[PDB]
Amino acid sequence: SKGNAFKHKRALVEHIIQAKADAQREKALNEEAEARRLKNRAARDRRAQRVAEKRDALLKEDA
Amino acid sequence: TRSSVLADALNAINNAEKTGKRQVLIRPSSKVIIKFLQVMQKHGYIGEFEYIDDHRSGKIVVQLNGRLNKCGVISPRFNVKIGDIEKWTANLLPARQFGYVILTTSAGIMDHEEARRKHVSGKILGFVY
Amino acid sequence: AKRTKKVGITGKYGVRYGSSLRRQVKKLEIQQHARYDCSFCGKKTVKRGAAGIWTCSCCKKTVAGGAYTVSTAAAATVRSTIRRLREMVEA
Amino acid sequence: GKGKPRGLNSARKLRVHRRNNRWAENNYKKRLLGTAFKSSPFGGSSHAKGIVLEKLGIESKQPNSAIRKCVRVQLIKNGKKVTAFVPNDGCLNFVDENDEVLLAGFGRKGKAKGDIPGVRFKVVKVSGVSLLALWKEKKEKPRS
Amino acid sequence: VLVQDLLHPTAASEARKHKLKTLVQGPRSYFLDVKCPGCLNITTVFSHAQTAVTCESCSTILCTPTGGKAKLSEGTSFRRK
Amino acid sequence: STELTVQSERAFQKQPHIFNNPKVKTSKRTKRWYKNAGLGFKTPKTAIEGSYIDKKCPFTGLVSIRGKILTGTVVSTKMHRTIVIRRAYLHYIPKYNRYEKRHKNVPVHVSPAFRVQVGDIVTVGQCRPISKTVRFNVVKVSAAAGKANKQFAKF
Amino acid sequence: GRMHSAGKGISSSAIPYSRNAPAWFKLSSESVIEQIVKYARKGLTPSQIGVLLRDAHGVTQARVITGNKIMRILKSNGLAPEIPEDLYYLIKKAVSVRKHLERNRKDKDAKFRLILIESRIHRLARYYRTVAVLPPNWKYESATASALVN
RNA sequence: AGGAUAGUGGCCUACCAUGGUUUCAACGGGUAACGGGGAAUAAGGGUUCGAUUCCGGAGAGGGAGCCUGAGAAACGGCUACC
RNA sequence: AGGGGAUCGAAGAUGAUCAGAUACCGUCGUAGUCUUAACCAUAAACUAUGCCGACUAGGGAUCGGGUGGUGUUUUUUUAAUGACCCACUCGGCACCUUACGAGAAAUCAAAGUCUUUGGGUUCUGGGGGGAGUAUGGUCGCAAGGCUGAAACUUAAAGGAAUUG
User: Fold this and answer.
1) Nucleotide I36 C1' to residue C76 CA (A)
2) What domains appear along chain E, each with residue ranges and CATH number?
């Protein structure tokens, strides 16, 4: 605003509205991508210790 | 830096035969080089050659039977039509009867002789006589 | 924008007084009006009060310096050679 | 090597490079700048009429020594005051001032031939009659 | 000499050629086994260690980096592997 | 498509020579006229159920794609319902037996049916002259990734 | 080589022909992977991880010992750096030289080195922003670069 | 969006937005430039010329306008200015 | 422009030589030579040899790094450790003999792998002058730089070697 390109109050408010929505779409993907990184890789990381050394290897082929 | 491996390959073979060395080392020997040597080898200009298979594109040892005179490249690979190939042979070969002009084609890499018989053309890798 | 190609601070003089004279003042005037680093608080706040008086906006230490610079080249080398003389007396 | 782009898609550079180096010619520069049409006594012609204004005794160059019997002819088509050689023996008695003569080139596209300084033309006809015929006395130059 | 078998050069020539100029480039570097005499821990030491590595037991310098093959300690036992 | 203030101009934009009678009320309550562009160019769905008008659209508009079909990348998308594509190719100089990369910037009219971006390859089709400099409409966005799916930033 | 020098040294590493763990190896793939991560939890370069592996243990080359190559596993394990390494130390090198010039005005030799270091930075960045490890328009601003390398 | 046209179209008019082309040469200038089929030379590759027997364009001293007509901005049609 | 300004030293004064000698030589001496801040941006800026890549011939030297040596040398006489040596090795500056090869030759180990012509690429030249001139543009405080003709003039200009 000390530089030009905010010709009036409405121009500043409409720029803030755009910038806020731009960051709030940015934050929408930020939480969404952060969700998958926490979810998809990590949730089945316990599946390895769960099933990989559980079935088809130790119990059925034991007697 | 290195731009055409076959260019350096046949430039190395040319220097080898000129000095008369019966064997030469070629690298890094892409498969266009092997196909090129197959064309020459079956015709008898070169004899035995070994493709040392390391994981760095490999190297080639060629046995020169003292029969090759000059094998060159025509860079860039000019797109030659089925008709202009005779103009290319007449410009590049010491005589009509012998010598070969190597073309990579839809049907593979072969000399200008069976390029006519296959009735296929393409680019010009080089020549051998 | 880039308001002047070469005159810069001397542009206040308009067209008069000759280009060479205006060039000489343009050199000494940017050097006179620049903020300078302070030797006691370490922040670029030393301004020129009067010719030869260099007052820091903070810590209010005024240094006696050159007319158009905090430290002249001559004063700098004199300080060095006075130090050279005092090192041989003290060592 | 060879200092020229042999790459398959280098056609643009080849043509531009050749098109700049064609300016180092003499003939091509003359043809493209039209120096015959612009700065030449003949506007790209082979022959041009004119008026013999006076006679010049043009001393030859070394090692020769002779008077070359040229004529100061001003060309009707552009007024240029050029000097024209007069071949064959005599033939300066055959022509006088305020005649009309047909000039031709001198055999070297400029660059006066022989031991003649600064004369790049030779007179072919005079009074509409061939100076060759006059030399052989077949015809007679009319007094017109 | 116009004739020699590049496929089968003498092993001395292989040892007398640069580590990458040879028929198939292979590392002239190897590995070591270093026991600190005061302790009972063995550790794999690269021939060009490049670092002053200490055994996992105690902060004792068992080798010293240098230009090529890193220097080994005087008071230690090295075993080629 | 089905949003974005379609009726934002002065005159009422509507496909001409159609009407939706208020006498009969149906389930859809609306009628939008579209068509297949042709030449195996299956109509994008957003045109089928769209709300924009774009009289010059190959699908929802009155223009027919007859003539040639071009293909090229997009270099500018910064006009209303029209972009400029750069159809780079090779010209064969016969003397030097060599090619040169010569390009033509082709401007084309995009219907809002396609989300077209810079870099993404598109195919266009000749039509009746849309404007002074446009004669082609985007008819399919050639997109496996479109130089955007794996080359643009992920937050 | 040395696109900013006339030197043509060939020094490098000539990895062996064998594409498998040597006979004398002891640790398992998980054991080396778990050893790599904690080295990186210290805040370590995959280049430093590889060299420290080669010395502390007999991990000749981590990509051979594991099924996956070093920085590959780190990004899968969630330690992916914000910007690529070789770019990063170019950035740190650039700011090192740049602060050197502010104090040293008449170091013309270092001034020339600066544009060579930046030339390297920009060509690396141009390549990276195609592979998209760097977001597009990621620019070496040369102003707040020191914020990126601290 | 309309007007105009035989119709398309900034072709024109209103409103709207800032677009368009460019070192892959835009734009500007020159042309002793009408374009092409072709002509001369020609080992091949090419070079130069192509006003000129055919196709296409433009013109009827120079611009401009228009009537008739299917077809003209016609000129062995007209009107005006030079 | 500021400081600095010992020596040397354009210009200049000068005393000599010379037919003349405001040239060589001698004495002095200004700008400059030095530095900081700005310029200029050219040099026989030359290896008169663009840059990158490979291959082709032998050698001994040397510089920097690396490797091997129950090699010599040093307070203690394999016992505390660098330098030297031999053999290699990469990179560097080059050097010598021969030229297979190349070149007009001189010569070149690249100036070779080019009429058996094509590894990639940038720049430049097209007889000599006129002329790096005019003009125009552009950068410079200026000196000038970069870019850059033509008319006209000429049958040579030139290179390398041979004999005298």
Assistant:
1) 12
2) 1-81 (2.20.25.100)
